[PDB]
Design a protein around this ligand. Structure first.
Ligand SMILES: CC(=O)N[C@H]1[C@H]([C@H](O)[C@H](O)CO)OC(C(=O)O)=C[C@@H]1O
Length: 655
């Protein structure tokens, strides 16, 4: 039970003195403080409460919990005369605003002198726990004599003044246990996660959300389940999915849809300290960066990049497709252990052929890229990961030997591929993966997918899938309803990571909106359903760092102000992946777009990285996004940071 509980304390920087109420309550010196609050203004560093020695000379003798204007939650515990200064925090811990209202958050700190740890909670997640050698509790700090809500009294003056309402605050004179505080901090914000740390996927981390609405009214999601922290590479990554049959109100428990089992789908506590955060899982095959489209016959397609163990965007050979052409057919090539050349091909029925004799061997490759010998699977030992400093070790479980694995008898060229799977039941079940043929040419690697959706161009029925090479756009398309694939390769002005998404403006007229390396969003126009493309133009109202970020843009089915509309989601800040905005663009008779409305998702300094939009069956808009800066090295390996939210068009008109 609490030693003090206060309510509805509204403050504009001035604080409230609770010294009488708390002096003498903290007999051990340990504490837990649970704060339900909303901010009226996010600017500046703000303390939810402060326990201090307030006398002259003692300004570095206090304990607080604080909020920053970027959503970071932290705590300090400091003592002047011993020059001890503890700081524990996690970025991207709270929400600011949502549809014009201050968001209620619930945060907590626990100081446990027996464990010498400080822990912080926010909205049902333990965002950080840190053992510190210079531990300080209230009793360790010399001359504590002032206890304040909404500030810290330093040398007779209020510092870090809070602006908002403390809805409820509880002080306890002991360290409460993990499960209790998680539960006390659960609130509405907790319910915005579709994918959560250590859910059914077994992953602690997620990136790259995709939302898509099927013609039956199902709203479908996919995501990268990233097991070895949030690194793009090297990593062990599966694609997970989850769906809603009620306009997004409730979602299925995630399922694994594309996954390799050379490593198991198990939760790892990836180190966030500078000394460990660069660590990667290096020996494991992966699927990464998903694209969803629904065909006109209602079959659903999902594409993803395929990385063999040890391969990524960084390491993949650019000068080999991994295919060989033999008698006009293209066959995936293989190198056998102990050979220097690639002497083998996978041909009809998955039969592995020795290219030197042009005869079938006793080996074959199954529909999931697993290897058999005389009809029986070959196996290898699965890896697990251990920390103490990281080890990847053989764990004694047998999985099928696979051509994408580190320990295979036959291996593919160490480059990146694309695979696609199809579903005839709106994503309850999926075919085995098909690898894309060497559409870029035999002597070039596959392109890299632009995460989000593809489209069906309405006048031709052409299926378009966005991708990029690092130097060109690669618009993968089919003119036979997905039976065969070709590509339009478009050289770009510079080395853009050209993650793109399409809209259709009018029949036969499409635009590709994409990331660049120059700070702007580019759009290229085709008036022949993607066969030829204009020179790039640039949006004038978004200004981002040079590296860029993925965007989402969709067609919307309903008129807005009497006009056909598109809806765009992007960060908009030169300071980082921040300041999420949703823009409404109304299409004019002449196919120019009037970018008439924008909505700021949260405050400007709050994190906003990869995103995905979909129109719900009821004509509201669903948004999932990375609510953190996914470029920053300081925001790596964070749990429960990819929420789902919804807007009415009337919400999006405001800002
Ligand atoms: C396949 C892959 O690596 N995709 C990643 C992509 C890529 O590395 C970059 O575009 C190279 O320039 O970058 C990012 C990113 O947050 O910036 C995330 C993607 O998942």
């Amino acid at each position: 039970t609490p030693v003090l509980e206060k309510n509805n304390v509204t403050l504009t920087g001035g604080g409230e003195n609770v010294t009488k109420e708390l002096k003498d309550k903290f007999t051990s010196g340990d504490f837990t403080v649970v704060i339900k609050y909303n901010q009226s203004s996010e600017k500046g560093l703000q303390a939810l409460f402060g326990i201090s020695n307030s006398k002259p000379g003692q300004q570095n003798s206090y304990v607080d919990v604080f909020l920053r204007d970027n959503g970071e939650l932290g705590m300090e515990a400091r003592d002047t005369s011993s020059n001890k200064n503890n700081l524990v925090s996690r970025p991207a811990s709270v929400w600011g605003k949502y549809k014009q209202e201050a968001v209620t958050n619930t945060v907590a700190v626990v100081a446990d002198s027996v464990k010498k740890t400080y822990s912080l909670y926010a909205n049902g997640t333990k965002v950080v726990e840190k053992k510190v050698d210079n531990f300080l509790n209230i009793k360790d700090i010399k001359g504590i004599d002032y206890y304040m809500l909404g500030g810290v009294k330093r040398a007779g003056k209020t510092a870090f003044g809070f602006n908002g309402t403390l809805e409820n605050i509880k002080f306890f004179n002991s360290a409460l246990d993990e499960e209790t505080v998680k539960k006390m901090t659960t609130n509405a914000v907790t319910g915005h996660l579709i994918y959560t740390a250590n859910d059914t996927t077994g992953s602690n981390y997620f990136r790259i959300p995709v939302l898509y609405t099927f013609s039956n009214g199902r709203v479908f999601s996919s995501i990268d389940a990233r097991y070895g922290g949030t690194h793009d590479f090297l990593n062990k990554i599966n694609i997970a999915t989850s769906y809603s049959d009620d306009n997004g109100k409730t979602w299925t428990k995630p399922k694994l849809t594309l996954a390799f089992d050379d490593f198991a789908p198990v939760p790892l506590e990836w180190p966030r300290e500078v000394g460990g955060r660069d660590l990667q899982i290096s020996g494991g095959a992966t699927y990464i960066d998903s694209v969803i489209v629904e065909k006109k016959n209602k079959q659903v397609l999902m594409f993803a990049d395929v990385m063999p163990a040890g391969v990524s965007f960084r390491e993949a050979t650019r000068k080999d497709s991994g295919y060989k052409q033999i008698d006009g057919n293209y066959y995936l090539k293989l190198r056998k252990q102990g050979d220097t050349d690639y002497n083998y091909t996978i041909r009809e029925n998955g039969t592995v052929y020795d290219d030197r004799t042009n005869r079938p061997t006793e080996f074959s490759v199954d529909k999931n890229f697993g290897i058999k010998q005389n009809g029986n699977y070959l196996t290898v030992e699965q890896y697990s990961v251990s920390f103490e400093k990281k080890t990847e070790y053989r764990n004694g479980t047998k999985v099928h030997m696979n051509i994408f694995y580190k320990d295979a008898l036959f291996k593919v060229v160490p480059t990146n591929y694309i695979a696609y799977i199809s579903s005839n039941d709106h994503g309850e079940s999926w075919s085995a993966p098909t690898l894309l043929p060497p559409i870029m040419g035999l002597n070039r690697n596959a392109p890299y997918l632009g995460p989000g959706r593809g489209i069906i161009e309405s006048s031709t029925g052409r299926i378009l899938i966005p991708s990029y090479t690092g130097k060109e756009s690669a618009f993968i398309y089919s003119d036979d309803n997905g039976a065969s694939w070709k590509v339009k390769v478009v050289p770009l002005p510079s080395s853009w990571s050209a993650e793109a998404q399409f809209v259709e403006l009018s029949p036969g007229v499409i635009q590709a909106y994409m990331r660049t390396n120059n700070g702007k969003i580019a759009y290229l126009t085709s008036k022949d359903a993607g066969t030829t493309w204009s020179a790039p133009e640039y949006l004038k109202f978004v200004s981002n760092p040079s590296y860029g970020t993925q965007l989402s843009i969709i067609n919307y089915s309903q008129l807005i102000d009497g006009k056909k509309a598109v809806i765009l989601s992007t960060p908009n800040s030169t300071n980082g992946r921040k300041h999420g905005q949703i823009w409404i663009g109304l299409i004019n008779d002449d196919n120019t777009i009037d970018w008439r409305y924008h909505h700021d998702v949260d405050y400007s300094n709050y994190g906003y990285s990869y995103s995905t939009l979909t129109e719900l069956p009821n004509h509201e808009i669903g948004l999932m996004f990375e609510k953190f800066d996914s470029w920053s090295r300081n925001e790596l390996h964070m749990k429960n940071v990819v929420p789902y939210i919804t807007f009415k068009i009337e919400d999006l008109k405001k800002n």
